[model samples]
Target chain A: EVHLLESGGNLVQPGGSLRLSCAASGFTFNIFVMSWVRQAPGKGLEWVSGVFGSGGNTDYADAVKGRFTITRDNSKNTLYLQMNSLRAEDTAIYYCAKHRVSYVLTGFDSWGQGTLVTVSSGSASAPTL
Target chain B: DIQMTQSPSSLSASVGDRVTITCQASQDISNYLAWYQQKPGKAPELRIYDASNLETGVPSRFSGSGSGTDFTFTISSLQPEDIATYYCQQYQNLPLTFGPGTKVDIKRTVAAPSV
Candidate 1:
């Protein structure tokens, strides 16, 4: 099984931006596709889009647009998902997953433990700090 | 944007019984759909991709079928561990979407619940 090491604690602030990372190990980082997912509080998981380092980036279900951004640093075998203009609605655990196969980007074989960021009260600048 | 729709928000079944989940897409996605099983507080596990092709190491009892915009995820012999949330996702195009999900639970049938 592939392992995704994610690092970060909890962030609390309203309207604060947050950045999460997914680090790949034990495999060729470029050989697989990775994606970010958002699990809303008391709601089902939503597709936040995927990035195929070899194939470029893919967006989520459209409704998630304008707020979510997914990017990667292939040299470090790490994937990042950044959320801007955070709102109470953006308060959820984010997951980064890697596909098992070549073509299909849905079958995520390995995933990170997930990171939780809380936006309670703060300006967008807090995200960077 | 392809919309993945799943039917029957939840289901109940006993061990050795057959269970099926259905998913439909707003647009024709051919065999670009995939199935996943998610346990509470965990990441989703891929079961099928390209409609019916089982993922490596997946049990044979778990089979998938259907094409176009419709698809099926069937468990021939339900196991106690199989009870969880199932989801369908389409990757045929960008803006990938997922079905709400179907939760399979234990059924209290005439027979005693399978362990």
Candidate 2:
């Protein structure tokens, strides 16, 4: 009955910032870890960042190092992905997922539906998802 | 940043065909690799973990093996519904990475067919 519902997608200008959230339910969020992944239209998947939990370290991919941050709100059982100083290349569908294993750093067993953010003034097209 | 790579970026196969996909890492990642499947317009789903362990509820037709820098994902009998892109990932180190992915489609009328 666990669920990870995501929201907060918008059409943002290149230098603007975007904050996405994934709300967890049907389980204890404080005991689980999570990761964020994204995929651009007609492209491969990218591992963005991951938060161990409300008290663990956040790891970011080399490609997103300084610009991306992963945080969580334990009381709300929610995870957040905050990105700033965005570039056109940042346009993609962001998904939040829970690690299959506790804090062992393994595959993800549960995932959020996904949120598409278009970082541009141009019209937005659908993502392959 | 251990790199991950997969062969046959895209392939067309038939139902009941034995389909095999290969993955390699930039260095010795031991058995810390995983495989995932993503159908069109859908979120990626976990299929295999720890290099060879099939995830819970996954079909037995799907299998994985290998360690260090080499790994393999196989479908003993590819089904029409198995059309999707498969990706390999490494978790031995931080900043996990995924392979470029192998797109599987049904051959011919099925979409891609078997030998």
Candidate 3:
């Protein structure tokens, strides 16, 4: 029954910035760690990074560092993923997931549906710098 | 970061058939390897972890084996619900890396295929 409520979809112009939020419910938010994953239209899943709720220790996958940042506010039981200087390649469905730790298995258990961030107007495609 | 390489980038199989996928790591990862299943428009779900342990609520048909730098994920009896892209991941080190992924498609052929 654990649920992660993420922000609505966003439409940002090229070179603009966007902030997304993921709030947890139905579970002890501070007990588990949260992570983010990105996926494009038909591409495979990409592990961005994750942060522990208490220690604030963050781990990022090599391919996703710098492009995204992970932060959280314990009191509100929410986590945030901010992408800077957006580009077309950065436009993908973002998900917030809770990493469940058990003696047997430690991995993502609960997840938010995902938030789509669309970039560009139509024909213009700004390449990643 | 440990590099993960999955074989059979794409495969075609039919229902009730047996299927297997392989994942190799650039270095020794002990048993920290995990597998995931991702369907269109949905988030990836953890299927196996610790090399061969199955996740809770996961079907018994899905099995895992292997250790160190090599691993395999097998499905005993493939069902229609099993059609999806499978990814292998290694969390042995920081900046966990994943394999390119193996896409499983519905095959119109006969016989069981094992990875």
Candidate 4:
């Protein structure tokens, strides 16, 4: 029974950056692969990135390449997603998922509650304020 | 990236009715597919993997079949709690892809008044 929790909901301005975290529990942290998925309001899910826990190998979606970074800290059992130069289209609910390893492919079996991130064009600095 | 497509984007059925959803992969995935069910405001739960194998703890009524690029998820008997969206994903290639999703709804039947 693996569990995941996102840091929290956030509001960021366009051109700014945001870092989101997902904490894992109830299982060995360094055994399974972790992935970040996103869903826009009333939209379907999208794969952002995935990172293997043991070797730290990373894979990113074609659309998210260069702008998104995925990292993990085995000591804290936490995975982080860092997005730079945000855009309004980037506003979505981000979720962390644990992928089940297999010989041929891996599937997500556990997921976090999700953290809503809103990016707006208003106020370039401290937009959430 | 392999594209995934699901049929009957939305369907309405009555309890005890048998419902089947179909998913097709753009290329052969060698049975490396999985299905998930998602309710509103909730995360998706895995139901089937490797084409026809049921995930642990999933109800027996929910079964999967087929292989290669074509697969089906059938609920032998629909239940009120089964109303939700179903998605199929193919993990055979890089940047795993998911189907658009199928929304299942419960069909209500009107009761007759007694004389």
Candidate 5:
């Protein structure tokens, strides 16, 4: 029963960046890889990015290739997702899930409750006239 | 990315009724498919993995089958608590993808007989 708690839901304006964190407890965090998935307000799920806790190797979806990054701080048993140059479509609930590769029982076996990120007017560039 | 699609986008079933949902992948994925249950306002839960192997602690009534590109997720006896959206996912390919999901609604108009 690994407990994964995702913390961070922010109101970011377009072009702003946000960093979300996922803390893992009840298990040896470094033994597993962690990945992020997101869903828009009323859309389907989308794979964002992932980081290997055991080695720190990272990979991301083409859609978010340059705008998103995922990394892990094994020392803190926490995983992170950094979204840059965010867009209105980027506003969604992001989840961190545990990954077990090279096994029969594969795919994300566990997931965080999800942290929200709502994009709107704020510190972003002025709205188009 | 491999596209995943589910049939009967949504359905309604009474308790003790049998319900089945289908998922089709754009390409062969062998048995590297998984089924998930997502309740409203909650994170998705893994119910079946490797296509047909039930996840630990999942109810026996929730089962899955099929391979290559077609898959099926079935609930032998649907329960009221089972009302939710179900998704199918493929892991055989990189950058895993999930189906649009099949929304299941439980029939609540009738009273259940005393157990």
Candidate 6:
């Protein structure tokens, strides 16, 4: 009955910053590794970043290294992904997932229903969950 | 970064048919491979890990095999619920990668008309 729920849909203007959250439930959140993944419309899945909840150790894919930051709030059993300087290319469905194995970088066993993030050139205000 | 590719980008099969999808990695990834299934409008579900090991609760009809750079995910007897997109992922290196995915659709068969 593991569950991960992403914040919600978002609309951001280019060059703006966006932050999203994923709440975990039905499992011991602090014992497993959590990660973020994205999929553009009609495209394949892309691994963004992962964090070991216990030690706070992190790993990022080469494509998202600098612009994306992944963090967690152990007390809240939640994980967050903050992206800076968004662009049209950043528009996608973002998901939060838990790695099946804690110590090894394996497959994602549980995932949140994804949140669609849209980045446009127009002046759009920050989004709220 | 390891690259992954899958064959038969799309396939159509009837229920109870044996189906198999192949994945090839650009370089050796040992046994750190996994398979996932995704239905429309839903998140992907893990089916296999470490190449051949079935994930907990997955049906025995679904199996995986191979090591190094090549792998295969097979459904011994496809079910109606198995129609979806299947993806292969490799975790042996940084920047985990997934295959382009193979879409499996249900192949319809016309029933014989009774006279």
For A6-104, candidate 6 gives per-residue lDDT tens digits of 885598877888899999999889999888989998789998988986746899977777888988999999888889878777789999988887744
Q: Give me candidate 3's TM-score against the actual structure.
A: 0.86
State TM-scores per candidate.
0.85, 0.91, 0.86, 0.90, 0.90, 0.90
Q: Calculate each model's fnat, 2 decimals.
A: 0.49, 0.53, 0.42, 0.58, 0.56, 0.74
Candidate with more favorable, higher DockQ: 2 or 3: 2
Report the candidate with higher TM-score, 3 versus 5. 5
Q: What lDDT tens digits, residue by residue, belong to model 1 across residues A1-129?
A: 478887653675665667788888988888777787777777777767777766385555566577767788888889887777767877778888887664444566666788887777644344555
Candidate 6's C-alpha runs over 4 A off are A122-129, B108-115
lDDT of 2 by residue, B25-79 (tens): 9989989988999888888888999888888899999999999988999999988
Task: Assess candidate 3 and give its lDDT.
Answer: 0.80
Give per-residue CA lDDT, model 6, range B14-37, as digits (tens). Answer: 789999999999988889888999
Candidate 3 regions exceeding 4 Å error are: A61-67, A102-106, A122-129, B109-115
Regions of model 4 farther than 4 Å from truth: A102-104, A122-129, B108-115
Indicate whether candidate 3 or candidate 4 has the larger DockQ: 4
Predictions' DockQ, in order: 0.42, 0.61, 0.41, 0.63, 0.53, 0.71
Off by over 4 Å in 2: A123-129, B109-115
- DockQ ranking, high to low: 6, 4, 2, 5, 1, 3
Displacement of residue A25 (Cα, Å) in model 5 is 1.1
Report lDDT per candidate. 0.77, 0.86, 0.80, 0.85, 0.84, 0.87
TM-score of chain B of each: 0.90, 0.92, 0.91, 0.91, 0.90, 0.91
The per-residue C-alpha lDDT of model 3 at residue A84 equals 72
Better of 3 and 5 by lDDT: 5
TM-score head-to-head 3 vs 6, winner:
6
| Two-way TM-score contest, 1 vs 5, winner | 5
Q: Provide the lowest-lDDT 10-residue window in model 3 chain B.
A: B106-115
